[PDB]
Ligand binder design. Structure first.
Ligand SMILES: Cc1cc2nc3c(=O)[nH]c(=O)nc-3n(C[C@H](O)[C@H](O)[C@H](O)COP(=O)(O)OP(=O)(O)OC[C@H]3O[C@@H](n4cnc5c(N)ncnc54)[C@H](O)[C@@H]3O)c2cc1C
Length: 392
């Protein structure tokens, strides 16, 4: 009863929903803090890239997963912005000074490699697949979830890391937030490095017309690429119309861009309409905490979605290091994370509005600053976002 010692192996069970970046990061952090986690994942089977900035990397290191970053992080050393017409350097500079101020190297990684490695680290045997949560209920003694397959599971703690379309989120919040279309469409994929495009150690972005085309190296001699185009949502466009779409959206753009359109494979290339969600002023309820996209859904414009989920997990584990008061721990988790992820969502949104011609004049002013940019201002801005993470 009331005299049970909750530190003993088996006395504290956390249920983690979602086996993506957040779910697996979370389970690893809790396990570090001596908590047993069962991880549940909706799909029976798994399935372009993210850049894990130094804040995410340090978190990965903290969680005992640093070897994955080191091994699979692409060689990112410098970045450039290029005029869309001439394909010429508006600005160019190295990221070394960023590695020095933040303590880590930035690590672009394929989403598929990152997914597999994290699974390998946690162990697939400890993940139950085909388990799609529909509902959680809590009472005095604990929390319970139900799955579509008719099964259920009970624990002391519930981690909702069930993604941008989180099914548990509404129970935590008391209402159902809706995705806001961000006003642009992203095409993304991988191609083999080919300097007829850009330097293999550089993050190169062509900007103009409220659009951009980006390349950055992941592992195994490869480029993560993407095109952004501001567009109404719902255009009749898929993998079969793809190369034609890109060809017209980027007509006139510098040869490297055209060579990219030719090089890519539409069947492996993704077309996603970008959304985010207005920040919540709550992340926890009783024994239940939102983690990752479930707790904050951002446009990918500053590359902090995945990083933020890793940050969440570090804080989660930290607040359970030396207490077994679940309600207090989750309150402190919320306390530490809520303003962070709100700022990250809003910063991403503003960057997005500037990048994609919400106000074409502000976007042109930004191009202007890119022509007059040494690298100091951008690096400062990046360090601000990174150093505001939990591991500073
Ligand atoms: C185009 C693009 C570029 C991006 N670039 C970056 C970047 O450069 N850097 C960065 O840090 N982030 C980036 N992100 C964001 C990053 O991909 C996400 O923030 C990250 O994957 C979120 O992790 P998650 O585990 O919370 O969500 P998810 O990866 O979506 O995981 C949710 C998991 O839960 C499962 N699930 C869903 N519903 C249920 C349910 N009801 N029951 C059980 N399981 C369920 C899903 O199958 C999934 O496995 C980018 C995102 C996009 C779209």
């Amino acid at each position: 009863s009331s005299g049970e010692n909750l530190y003993f192996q088996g006395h504290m069970k956390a249920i983690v929903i979602g086996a993506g970046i957040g779910g697996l990061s979370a389970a690893v952090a809790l396990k570090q803090s001596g908590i047993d986690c069962d991880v549940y994942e909706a799909v029976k089977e798994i399935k372009a890239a993210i850049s894990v900035w130094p804040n995410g990397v340090k978190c990965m290191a903290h969680l005992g997963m640093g070897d994955i970053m080191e091994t699979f992080g692409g060689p990112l050393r410098r970045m450039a912005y290029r005029d869309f017409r001439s394909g010429e350097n508006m600005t160019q500079f190295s990221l070394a000074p960023l590695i020095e101020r933040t303590g880590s190297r930035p690590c672009p990684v394929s989403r598929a490699e990152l997914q597999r490695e994290m699974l390998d680290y946690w162990g697939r045997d400890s993940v139950q697949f085909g388990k799609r949560v529909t509902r959680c209920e809590e009472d005095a003694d604990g929390v319970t979830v139900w799955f579509t397959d008719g099964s259920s599971a009970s624990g002391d703690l519930l981690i909702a890391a069930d993604g941008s379309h989180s099914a548990l989120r509404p129970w935590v919040l008391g209402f159902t937030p809706q995705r806001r279309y961000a006003g642009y469409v992203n095409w993304n994929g991988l191609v083999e490095i080919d300097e007829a495009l850009a330097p293999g150690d550089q993050w190169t972005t062509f900007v103009g017309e409220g659009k951009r085309v980006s390349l950055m190296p992941v592992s195994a001699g490869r480029f993560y690429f993407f095109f952004d185009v501001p567009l109404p949502a719902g255009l009749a466009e898929d993998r079969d119309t793809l190369r034609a779409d890109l060809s017209r959206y980027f007509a006139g753009w510098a040869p490297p861009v055209q060579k990219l359109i030719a090089a890519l494979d539409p069947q492996t290339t993704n077309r996603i309409e970008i959304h985010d969600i207005e920040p919540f002023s709550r992340l926890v309820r009783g024994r239940v905490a939102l983690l990752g996209d479930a707790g904050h859904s951002t446009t990918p414009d500053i590359g902090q979605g995945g990083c933020a989920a890793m940050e969440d997990a570090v804080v989660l584990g930290a607040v359970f290091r030396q207490t077994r008061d679940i309600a207090a721990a989750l309150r402190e988790y919320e306390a530490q994370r809520c303003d962070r992820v709100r700022d990250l969502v809003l910063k991403a949104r503003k960057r997005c509005d500037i990048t994609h011609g919400k106000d074409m004049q502000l976007t042109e002013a930004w191009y202007q600053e890119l022509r007059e940019e040494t690298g100091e201002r951008i690096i400062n801005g990046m360090c601000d976002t990174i150093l505001s993470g939990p591991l500073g």
